[PDB]
Short mmCIF file of C-alpha atoms in Angstrom, two decimals:
data_model
loop_
_atom_site.label_atom_id
_atom_site.label_comp_id
_atom_site.label_asym_id
_atom_site.label_seq_id
_atom_site.Cartn_x
_atom_site.Cartn_y
_atom_site.Cartn_z
CA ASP A 61 36.40 -3.54 -93.61
CA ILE A 62 35.56 0.31 -93.76
CA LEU A 63 31.63 -1.02 -92.74
CA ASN A 64 33.31 -2.23 -89.21
CA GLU A 65 34.86 0.65 -88.68
CA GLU A 66 31.99 2.71 -89.38
CA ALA A 67 30.23 0.11 -86.78
CA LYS A 68 32.61 1.37 -84.09
CA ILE A 69 32.05 5.00 -84.81
CA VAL A 70 28.55 5.31 -85.56
CA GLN A 71 28.41 3.14 -82.08
CA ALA A 72 30.69 5.16 -80.25
CA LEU A 73 28.62 8.15 -81.26
CA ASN A 74 25.56 6.79 -79.89
CA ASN A 75 27.11 5.58 -76.84
CA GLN A 76 28.17 9.21 -76.06
CA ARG A 77 24.68 10.56 -76.91
CA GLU A 78 23.31 7.83 -74.54
CA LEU A 79 26.06 9.13 -72.00
CA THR A 80 25.26 12.70 -71.88
CA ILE A 81 20.78 12.17 -71.93
CA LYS A 82 21.50 10.25 -69.18
CA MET A 83 23.89 12.41 -67.58
CA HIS A 84 21.62 15.40 -68.03
CA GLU A 85 18.70 13.03 -66.21
CA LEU A 86 21.24 12.90 -63.76
CA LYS A 87 21.87 16.71 -63.31
CA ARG A 88 17.94 17.04 -63.02
CA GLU A 89 17.26 14.19 -60.66
CA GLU A 90 15.90 15.03 -57.00
CA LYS A 91 18.89 14.96 -54.75
CA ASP A 92 18.58 14.16 -51.25
CA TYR A 93 19.61 15.58 -48.24
CA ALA A 94 23.02 13.81 -47.31
CA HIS A 95 24.34 14.79 -51.04
CA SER A 96 23.03 18.43 -50.98
CA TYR A 97 23.69 19.86 -47.61
CA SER A 98 26.06 18.24 -44.75
CA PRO A 99 26.41 14.62 -44.82
CA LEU A 100 26.56 14.10 -41.10
CA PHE A 101 23.59 15.81 -39.25
CA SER A 102 21.43 13.92 -41.76
CA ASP A 103 18.36 15.35 -40.14
CA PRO A 104 17.43 19.18 -40.96
CA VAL A 105 15.47 19.16 -37.80
CA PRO A 106 16.77 22.45 -36.13
CA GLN A 107 16.20 22.01 -32.32
CA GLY A 108 18.10 25.33 -31.48
CA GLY A 109 18.15 27.96 -28.75
CA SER A 110 18.21 25.25 -25.55
CA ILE A 111 18.46 27.37 -22.67
CA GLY A 112 15.21 28.55 -21.55
CA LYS A 113 13.28 25.89 -23.77
CA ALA A 114 10.05 24.43 -22.69
CA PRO A 115 8.93 20.37 -22.84
CA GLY A 116 6.57 19.93 -25.29
CA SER A 117 8.25 21.80 -28.76
CA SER A 118 8.59 18.62 -30.85
CA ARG A 119 5.38 17.56 -32.83
CA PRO B 2 7.99 34.36 -22.83
CA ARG B 3 8.34 38.32 -23.47
CA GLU B 4 9.03 41.63 -21.58
CA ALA B 5 5.53 43.83 -21.68
CA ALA B 6 5.23 46.98 -23.92
CA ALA B 7 5.22 50.54 -24.54
CA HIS B 8 1.66 50.97 -22.82
CA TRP B 9 0.25 47.33 -21.72
CA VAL B 10 -3.02 47.51 -20.17
CA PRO B 11 -3.52 45.34 -17.77
CA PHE B 12 -7.56 43.08 -18.12
CA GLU B 13 -8.96 40.29 -16.34
CA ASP B 14 -12.14 38.15 -17.02
CA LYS B 15 -14.71 37.40 -14.66
CA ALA B 16 -15.23 33.63 -15.66
CA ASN B 17 -15.14 30.22 -14.32
CA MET B 18 -13.55 26.75 -15.08
CA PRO B 19 -16.33 25.85 -17.13
CA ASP B 20 -17.01 21.97 -16.80
CA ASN B 21 -15.03 18.82 -15.81
CA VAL B 22 -11.73 20.07 -13.49
CA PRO B 23 -12.64 19.98 -10.06
CA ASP B 24 -11.47 22.73 -8.11
CA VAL B 25 -8.32 22.33 -6.23
CA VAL B 26 -6.84 23.77 -3.41
CA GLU B 27 -4.57 26.66 -5.21
CA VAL B 28 -1.81 27.81 -3.79
CA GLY B 29 -2.17 30.64 -1.41
CA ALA B 30 1.55 31.21 -0.64
CA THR B 31 3.88 33.60 -1.33
CA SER B 32 7.39 33.96 -2.86
CA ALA B 33 9.36 34.18 0.00
CA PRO B 34 7.78 30.74 1.98
CA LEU B 35 7.94 28.87 -1.36
CA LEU B 36 11.20 30.07 -1.85
CA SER B 37 12.16 28.55 1.49
CA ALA B 38 10.28 25.43 1.14
CA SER B 39 11.37 24.99 -2.76
CA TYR B 40 13.44 22.14 -1.71
CA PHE B 41 11.08 20.23 0.41
CA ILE B 42 8.10 20.08 -2.04
CA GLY B 43 11.10 19.07 -4.59
CA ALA B 44 12.44 16.33 -2.60
CA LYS B 45 8.52 15.09 -1.36
CA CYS B 46 6.86 15.89 -4.94
CA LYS B 47 9.84 15.19 -6.99
CA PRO B 48 8.35 11.99 -9.16
CA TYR B 49 4.92 14.23 -9.52
CA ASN B 50 6.33 17.36 -11.28
CA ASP B 51 8.78 15.01 -13.05
CA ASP B 52 5.79 13.31 -14.53
CA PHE B 53 4.22 17.03 -15.08
CA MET B 54 6.96 17.95 -17.29
CA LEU B 55 7.12 14.82 -18.97
CA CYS B 56 3.67 14.57 -20.01
CA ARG B 57 3.63 18.35 -21.27
CA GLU B 58 6.23 17.07 -23.17
CA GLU B 59 4.80 14.36 -24.58
CA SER B 60 1.43 16.64 -25.70
CA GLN B 61 2.94 18.50 -28.12
CA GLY B 62 0.19 20.82 -29.39
CA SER B 63 -1.79 19.25 -26.90
CA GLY B 64 0.09 20.45 -24.08
CA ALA B 65 -2.05 22.57 -21.46
CA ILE B 66 -5.48 21.00 -22.59
CA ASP B 67 -4.04 17.35 -21.65
CA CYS B 68 -2.92 17.06 -18.12
CA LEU B 69 -5.53 18.90 -16.39
CA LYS B 70 -5.47 16.08 -13.97
CA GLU B 71 -2.11 16.47 -13.63
CA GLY B 72 -1.96 20.26 -12.91
CA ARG B 73 -4.76 19.30 -9.96
CA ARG B 74 -2.28 16.05 -8.98
CA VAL B 75 1.27 18.06 -8.60
CA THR B 76 -0.42 21.67 -6.70
CA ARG B 77 -2.29 19.68 -4.20
CA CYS B 78 0.45 17.52 -2.52
CA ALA B 79 2.85 20.93 -2.25
CA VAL B 80 -0.15 22.31 -0.51
CA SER B 81 0.01 19.08 1.58
CA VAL B 82 3.67 19.59 2.29
CA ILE B 83 3.25 23.54 3.00
CA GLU B 84 0.13 22.74 5.68
CA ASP B 85 2.59 20.12 6.92
CA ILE B 86 5.17 22.65 7.76
CA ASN B 87 2.66 25.24 8.95
CA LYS B 88 1.79 22.70 11.72
CA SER B 89 5.52 21.55 12.28
CA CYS B 90 8.10 24.37 12.34
CA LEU B 91 6.16 27.56 11.50
CA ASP B 92 8.23 29.47 14.05
CA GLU B 93 11.56 28.87 12.62
CA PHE B 94 10.38 28.47 8.81
CA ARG B 95 8.75 31.46 9.40
CA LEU B 96 12.00 33.16 10.36
CA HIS B 97 13.70 31.84 7.54
CA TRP B 98 11.76 34.16 5.32
CA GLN B 99 11.34 36.50 7.87
CA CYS B 100 15.18 36.90 7.52
CA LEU B 101 14.78 35.83 3.77
CA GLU B 102 12.21 38.78 3.31
CA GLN B 103 15.33 41.38 3.32
CA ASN B 104 18.49 40.58 0.62
CA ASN B 105 16.28 41.08 -2.09
CA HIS B 106 15.43 37.24 -1.56
CA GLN B 107 19.45 36.51 -2.02
CA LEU B 108 19.87 33.22 -0.35
CA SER B 109 23.20 34.02 0.61
CA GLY B 110 21.72 36.19 3.38
CA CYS B 111 19.85 33.81 5.97
CA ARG B 112 22.68 30.96 6.69
CA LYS B 113 21.89 30.93 10.29
CA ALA B 114 18.68 30.33 10.57
CA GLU B 115 18.61 27.87 7.45
CA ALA B 116 20.37 25.20 9.56
CA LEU B 117 18.16 25.62 12.32
CA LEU B 118 15.33 24.65 9.84
CA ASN B 119 17.35 22.15 8.47
CA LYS B 120 17.17 20.08 11.50
CA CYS B 121 13.48 20.85 12.24
CA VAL B 122 12.33 19.31 9.04
CA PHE B 123 13.68 16.04 9.24
CA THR B 124 12.87 15.51 12.77
CA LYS B 125 9.16 15.85 12.28
CA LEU B 126 8.46 15.97 8.26
CA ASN B 127 11.56 13.69 7.88
CA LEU B 128 12.64 15.63 4.81
CA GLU B 129 15.98 16.65 3.75
CA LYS B 130 17.43 19.22 1.20
CA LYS B 131 19.77 17.28 -1.68
CA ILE B 132 21.30 19.19 -4.34
CA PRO B 133 20.96 16.55 -7.05
CA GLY B 134 23.81 17.17 -10.04
CA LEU B 135 26.16 17.76 -7.06
CA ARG B 136 28.91 14.99 -8.23
CA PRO B 137 30.97 13.74 -4.98
CA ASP B 138 33.84 15.00 -3.26
CA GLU B 139 32.05 18.60 -3.44
CA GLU B 140 30.52 20.40 -0.67
CA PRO B 141 27.01 21.58 -1.06
CA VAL B 142 27.71 25.00 0.05
CA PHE B 143 24.75 25.52 2.55
CA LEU B 144 26.76 22.62 4.47
CA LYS B 145 29.97 24.24 4.45
CA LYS B 146 31.85 26.49 7.04
CA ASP B 147 33.35 29.61 7.00
CA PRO B 148 31.50 30.89 3.29
CA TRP B 149 33.53 33.13 1.40
CA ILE B 150 30.17 35.42 0.68
CA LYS B 151 29.22 36.08 4.19
CA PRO B 152 25.85 38.31 4.44
CA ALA B 153 25.13 41.80 5.52
CA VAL B 154 23.38 41.90 8.56
CA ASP B 155 21.90 38.40 9.66
CA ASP B 156 18.47 39.18 11.43
CA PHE B 157 18.46 39.76 15.11
CA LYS B 158 15.97 36.94 16.11
CA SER B 159 17.53 34.19 14.32
CA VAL B 160 21.11 34.61 16.03
CA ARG B 161 19.67 34.31 19.20
CA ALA B 162 17.54 31.42 18.14
CA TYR B 163 20.97 29.88 16.79
CA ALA B 164 22.38 30.78 20.37
CA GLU B 165 19.58 28.77 22.16
CA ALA B 166 19.64 25.61 19.81
CA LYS B 167 23.44 25.25 20.90
CA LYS B 168 22.18 26.29 24.35
CA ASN B 169 19.10 23.12 24.00
CA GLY B 170 22.18 21.26 22.34
CA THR B 171 19.17 20.51 19.03
CA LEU B 172 22.26 21.64 17.07
#
């Protein structure tokens, strides 16, 4: 009975360890632009200042 | 795309169009004639100039080096229009910018000289000033009557020419 209880406790702690180590990898994971900056306006392409604009500026 | 300096110095280079581009008939028109005939060279050479800005658009980085064939294209047809109006309505067109050489090229100056020209080019060269973007039930402002901004001094020649346009019934 006591070994079954400790099986539950030690597996709970290993669930805790493999929770947190994964969450640390979830921290340092490369974030997409949609999460990092504004969700809409998915491009970072500025295309700003459009009054005296010249055809051919995009590349 | 930028104003000049503290002490800028002008400079030129006596060189030539090197190898491949043939010579063109380059526009030797000063500002007042081309400003007067701007609508007509925009009317006849519309899709040519539209192609010009399209090709300058799609050539990102190439840009200037790409569309030399087209810079050859779009200038020549405008030269054709101004030579045709040199043959066509040279008195009245010249008179329109004889008026428009005053008034700091403000187009508000020369309405009575303008409407004399509008019949003329539409008669012989059969072109027409049209303002795009103007949605209907809106008067084009060089067609309207009793303008608010009446000009300072109409020239003495085209007012008499306007009276004679009435007496001949050309208007």
